[PDB]
């Protein structure tokens, strides 16, 4: 994995590790999941953290986050788990995630984005070139190696 792939995965870690203390707690994952219109119970939040927390101290540190991100063979979701993921982004239900919907989602994650940064984000998953992310395009970003 490239050194900039690491930096990118560091940037994602920053989204979860709200208080920047170098660990993600069940509390912080809670607040991320709620900021995306989701609603996990406390025990759900403990299941998620355990399946990454390799060393069993209750939290995710960056070395454990890097390992999650880096390492997974192919096997992947039901089109049901993907749909619910797609629907966090497709705020108005129309079938297309636009630049404005992504920007809104980022803001909720405490992320201070510029239009050009948003547009380049649309660019990585936009495949037909329409400036938006349909679901078929969403799948591929979620579902490929």
């Amino acid at each position: 994995l490239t050194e900039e792939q690491i930096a990118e995965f560091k940037e994602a870690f920053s989204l979860f590790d709200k208080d920047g203390d170098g660990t993600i707690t069940t509390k912080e994952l809670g607040t991320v999941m709620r900021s995306l219109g989701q609603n996990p119970t406390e025990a759900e939040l403990q299941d998620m953290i355990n399946e990454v927390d390799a060393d069993g101290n209750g939290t995710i540190d960056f070395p454990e986050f890097l390992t999650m991100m880096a390492r997974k063979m192919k096997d992947t979701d039901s089109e049901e788990e993907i749909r619910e993921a797609f629907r966090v982004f497709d705020k108005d239900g129309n079938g297309y995630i636009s630049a404005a919907e992504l920007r809104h989602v980022m803001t909720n994650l405490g992320e201070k984005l510029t239009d050009e940064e948003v547009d380049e984000m649309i660019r990585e998953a936009d495949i037909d070139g329409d400036g938006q992310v349909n679901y078929e395009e969403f799948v591929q970003m979620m579902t490929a190696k």
Binding site: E8, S14, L15, F16, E44, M48, E51, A125
Partner: peptide, 17 residues
Amino acid sequence: ATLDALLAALRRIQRAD
């Protein structure tokens, strides 16, 4: 950060077993 990394993080973190 990268839609890629965000989605992957969210997808991989949600797996509860």
